[PDB]
Design a protein around this ligand. Structure first.
Ligand SMILES: Nc1ncnc2c1ncn2[C@@H]1O[C@H](COP(=O)(O)OP(=O)(O)OP(=O)(O)O)[C@@H](O)[C@H]1O
Ligand SMILES: Nc1ncnc2c1ncn2[C@@H]1O[C@H](COP(=O)(O)OP(=O)(O)OP(=O)(O)O)[C@@H](O)[C@H]1O
Ligand SMILES: [Ca+2]
Lengths: 300, 299
């Protein structure tokens, strides 16, 4: 294999907890031999086939195999991998700027021009993944972090490749996962999956970024899932009164059930709201404001 | 109808009995009577987008269901308290632990004794289905024993968080439950009804007799694929001693089409559960279930 069969603490000073998940716990760490800081993701290994605790080795191996391929300014980087009896430790690029949303919710003002630039960083990272036929499958606010939040315009880093999967043509992939608020119809309906699900998720994230409201979120999970499969949502003037038709058009073409009619990552990159084809479109975007009030309300 | 009062004014809260993603169960004793119960604290969800706690409407719905059910094989609701953060379900105390843990330490086990426990489960499910209540979370860890310390333990079905009342002509669809035990209609996101409970019964029986699991793959993805394809077998390695009637019982439960699947009444009427003659009963009496594989899987 490739996993270092050594004590990670022999080589890293283990620091304070960054965050935790279902089967992983992530901590700051410093490599003794270089003094360089990283994030150590301790993934609990699954002990038996019929256990809901931890992660089976093959899937961990899958996450690593994917991480080793990815080198891009908007994606986290893999440094090394260790393993003992209980855990597999992913040594990852440390992202210290927290989440993007928490940063935006901190903001005094924010135009669509500023918004689309953050969104383009995300598109840039997703474009690179899709090029290598990699589906993230876990695109959601908390997996969108910032390297350094103490600069005027922070850099985005996509994390958490636990659900990432390489798409092979002819090889049907179906599975049930992800947070209901952000999953595409083909996930809910347990239908063939591909690169398009990422694009739907981008639509949802954009909807929220601009309005503070969530397109399909119901009072209960049953409703959310029903909303998703009916593609039932609206641009409530209460929240969208200042949002530009271009933004709405961008969102509309993402939140589409038929996977084939949904915008690709390249088409998203080339959408006028992201890449204006003239002066006029640029000014409009520059004149549209994000609903920071409602956004703060929902994410506070 | 939730008492807006401190549970602790009316109960002595004892040791923690168990815990899940949303609740923590503790032993308790009512002061006025000195009777013991299990106090299940459910954290109320605070925001629609939050993944923590449970929506209050859903908790209200579970209680609405619990209040209706009185049956020896179903847990009994005693009372409901509520404070800032938690809804506290005061439930019948069950002290015998989980059925499987008890089987896993049993010396010997025949099919007769197995159908005895399965019968109790069917009785409890039948009562529910008569009132149109689908459990939707039938799995080993929700099959508890009242006593543990007797020749034949009494089964109590617990955990009604996913329970739902099936309304005629009102489609119900949702994603939930443990993959190993969910029906194809759940995986496929299709109309849900009383049939899902029956599929789960089949899986539980399959495990009980062989120690093996019918659709369990190396990953959740495979398990789901196995379920929707209804791809399983009776591996001789594990089913060598299993009676034909037993396999027929399971075979009629693990069926994709919800209209073909055995109903609870048909399950109670199956010859493996309710033999039609002396001959059938003997075959079940001499049918020994090897506990070896079961213990390997559940110790
Ligand atoms: N490189 C990193 N730097 C700082 N914090 C991180 C880093 N990677 C992950 N985290 C923390 O862990 C979370 C990311 O999820 P993680 O990669 O732990 O997935 P997981 O726990 O294996 O599965 P899931 O979290 O999806 O249930 C983030 O919320 C973040 O707070
Ligand atoms: N009535 C009871 N009497 C004694 N112990 C109980 C009782 N109910 C639950 N417990 C203990 O708590 C554990 C979990 O109970 P239960 O399965 O109802 O909740 P959960 O599965 O943790 O949460 P969820 O409702 O989200 O599934 C059980 O395994 C059991 O050990
Ligand atoms: Ca379907």
């Amino acid at each position: 294999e490739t996993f270092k069969q050594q004590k990670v603490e022999d080589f890293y000073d283990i620091g304070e907890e960054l965050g935790s998940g279902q089967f992983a716990i992530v901590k700051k760490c410093r490599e003794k031999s270089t003094g360089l800081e990283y994030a150590a993701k301790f993934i609990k290994k699954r002990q038996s086939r019929a256990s809901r605790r931890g992660v089976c080795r093959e899937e961990i191996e899958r996450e690593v195999s994917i991480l080793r391929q990815v080198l891009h300014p908007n994606i986290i980087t893999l440094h090394d991998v260790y393993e003992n009896r209980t855990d597999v430790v992913l040594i990852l690029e440390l992202v210290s700027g927290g989440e993007l949303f928490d940063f935006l919710a901190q903001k005094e003002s924010l135009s669509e021009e500023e918004a689309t630039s953050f969104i383009k960083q995300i598109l840039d990272g997703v474009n690179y993944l899709h090029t290598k036929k990699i589906a993230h499958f876990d695109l959601k606010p908390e997996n969108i972090m910032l390297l350094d939040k103490n600069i005027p315009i922070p850099h985005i880093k996509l994390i958490d490749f636990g659900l990432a999967h390489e798409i092979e043509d002819g090889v049907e992939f179906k599975n049930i996962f992800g947070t209901p608020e952000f999953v595409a119809p083909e996930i809910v309906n347990y239908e063939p999956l591909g690169l398009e699900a990422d694009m739907w998720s981008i639509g949802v994230i954009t909807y929220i970024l601009l309005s503070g409201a969530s397109p399909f979120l119901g009072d209960t999970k049953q409703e959310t899932l029903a909303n998703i499969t009916a593609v039932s949502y609206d641009f409530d003037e209460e929240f969208f009164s200042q949002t530009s038709e271009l933004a709405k058009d961008f969102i509309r073409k993402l939140l589409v059930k038929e996977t084939r009619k949904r915008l690709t990552i390249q088409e998203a990159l080339r959408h006028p709201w992201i890449t204006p084809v003239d002066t006029q479109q640029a000014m409009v975007r520059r004149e549209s404001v994000v609903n920071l009030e409602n956004f703060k309300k929902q994410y506070v």
